[model samples]
Target: VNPTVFFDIAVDGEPLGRVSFELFADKVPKTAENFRALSTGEKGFGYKGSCFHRIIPGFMCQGGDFTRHNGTGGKSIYGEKFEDENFILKHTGPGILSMANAGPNTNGSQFFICTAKTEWLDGKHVVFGKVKEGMNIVEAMERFGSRNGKTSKKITIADCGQL
Candidate 1:
């Protein structure tokens, strides 16, 4: 079975809702494992308290930069970086979870949740999961997003864990 994880979000200090994801461990084990471990914080550093620094309306919401809490920094459980596990999964529709990287094989702790069909990213980003619930919360997050990938209000991952 796929591993399920969750993020309890808050916008500008106000509680939003939980966004649960079903990681495609069956297809993307390495990539999915990275996100799972990060959510659990079993390594002592993880997604909790991190902010979604980049939000693009009608596109996606990106975050998981636990180190800098911004777009500039984050590390994978393996190290500062890791290879693209594969591109078998496609960004066919909304709520798809994919790795965010600087370039090829530069995936770290950053990831994004699609707000719409983003087929253009299929070959570039590693798709490892999809939102199983609370997609409305993600839609709510879009309200704070702008075309420039900036958020009008801070969207924070108040809590995250394997569930």
Candidate 2:
């Protein structure tokens, strides 16, 4: 249940510290590979500069769409929408990290984070990693939510690198 490795997140030259996110190999092995590939600097996702296209606090926060170079969201989902119910990693609680998909199995570069427990999205999306370090960042973004859905704090993955 603990397949978490370690990743050092950075913005420009600032280090965000190490995060130990469970690999979730039990539910999303392929999805994990896709994420690793995407994060692999060269072959991986290289998610730096990516924007959180949509952010709906109390619901979820999403990002990771290369098509949106201008920092906009397009119509494209990700990998297979597998069904891995309350298996410990599938959206079983709050702050659960899950894949962002356009359609089934189209999870290329989109993911979400839940504020409250979201059990419904278990087998529908890929539960990849969890927030391990920057909960403040997450909270800051939440404050940006204008109740009507508008904010200035944009959630961007400045950098994702090895520890």
Candidate 3:
């Protein structure tokens, strides 16, 4: 089995780059499954039209809120929020993909990719995918800076599938 997935990212209706992800499926099966299912639109919805709802320069960019186009809304493939894996994966550097949750055991569809080291978020969120390719592209996306109340640039996952 390929055990990896790829996502084609686009910004403002333009092509950005292709990102390859190595999902920690073995260590966090349920969480990985949730992400995989959602990314694949198995429930008829995926991260395709999701935006980079939140952004922070030299820090991270958050997205996958396909429901409300904002950070406050998103759900799992199961139609509800799910418990957090709470797994310990060091947010050691940039390009680390992790789940964005409200609190303990409340992970849903929201996720973020680090543009710089953010060791502070270690055990608080689930680190499911690692950017195996296109770190520079991720950095480009990160340069959008903080969105605050305004809408961040559109980051659509034009297509995502297992590799």
Candidate 4:
């Protein structure tokens, strides 16, 4: 209960954010496996109490590290992925959501929401899902981001179960 990322989301009042397995299963098999077993969980990486800690303002906020929020954990820095220069899954737009990784095939749980429009992320990340109707929620979450790289406060995942 204290671990595992679940999105207990309620869109406009209807609970429909239960996307843990689906988001991990078909879309990104390896990345999903690594994320599901996040060090934050009991039998894995245990990387909770982490934060988005770094923000580049109009660029992006970086985190996913068990300690630094910059995703510094040297877990499986590798994955079963290949660079796709023509990735079709585009992000939804400002407040757009996606995984935060070092390269096109290095994602592992840590994700970021674009504070603004960013076409540069097109072929770089796997756009698995969108915030749907929580642009404001995402906006508020970005406020907790760090400027010089370090969480202003511990940014926990809360409870990400069926919305």
* Residue ranges of candidate 3 with Cα displaced over 4 Å: 147-152
Model 2, residue 136: distance off in Å is 3.3
lDDT of each: 0.95, 0.56, 0.79, 0.50
**lDDT for each residue of candidate 4 in 86-124, tens digit (9 for 90 to 100):** 345676467555677676556555666567777877778
Query: Would you give me the overall lDDT of model 4?
Result: 0.50
CA lDDT, candidate 4, residue 68: 50
Per-residue alpha-carbon lDDT of candidate 3 for residues 36-133, written as tens digits (9 for 90 to 100)? 88777777887866677777787788888888987888898766688877576778888888999898888889988888888888878888878988
Global lDDT of model 1: 0.95
Candidate 1 lDDT over 1-163, as tens digits, reads 8999999999988999999999999999999999999999999899999999999999999999988887889999999999999999999999999999999999999999999999999899999999999999999999999989988999999999999
TM-score for each candidate, following the candidate numbering: 0.98, 0.69, 0.90, 0.59
Clashes of 3: 0
lDDT of 2 at 55: 65
lDDT of 2 by residue, 1-163 (tens): 5344334433333544443345555665766655555555555335656655566677765656666643344332133233333334667665677876555555555666666688887667767777666555565566555554444455556656533
Candidate scoring better on lDDT of 2 and 3: 3
Model 1, residue 113: C-alpha shift (Å)? 0.3
lDDT of 2 at 153: 54
Ranking by TM-score: 1, 3, 2, 4
Worst 10 residues of 3 by lDDT: 143-152
